[PDB]
């Protein structure tokens, strides 16, 4: 008849496939976040480092001076 109906139906088909694309890209985002969580697990690391001198230089590794107490 008149391709205006072609426009509108192709637009609603673009709309449904765009909803599908948004859902799929969100699954991609969640899966890539899971991958990055796996990688930060591989790059994760103790409790002895927090023993008696809890604070210590990243250079020398000695605590702060003694308190007055």
């Amino acid at each position: 008849e008149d391709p205006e109906t072609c426009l509108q139906l192709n637009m609603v088909y673009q709309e449904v496939i765009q909803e599908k694309l948004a859902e799929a890209n969100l699954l991609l985002a969640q899966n890539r976040e899971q991958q990055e969580e796996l990688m930060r697990d591989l790059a994760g690391s103790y409790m002895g480092h927090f023993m008696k001198p809890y604070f210590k230089d990243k250079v020398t590794g000695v605590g702060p001076p003694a308190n007055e107490d």
Binding site: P3, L7, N10, I17, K20, L21, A24, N31, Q35
Partner: protein, 49 residues
């Protein structure tokens, strides 16, 4: 955890394949849209005379 890791990556490649298919569909869809705009401009041009 590599069992789960490989399950997740295989799902990832599958969903990337689906996204490739749907993206090709979207591109050809918008090309059809431009074709429709061109032809409707040409055809309404035949009643503004």
């Amino acid at each position: 955890m590599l069992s789960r890791l490989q399950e997740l990556r295989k799902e990832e490649e599958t969903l990337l394949r689906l996204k490739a298919a749907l993206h090709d569909q979207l591109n050809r869809l918008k090309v059809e849209e431009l074709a429709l705009q061109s032809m409707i401009s040409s055809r309404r041009g035949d009643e503004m005379l």
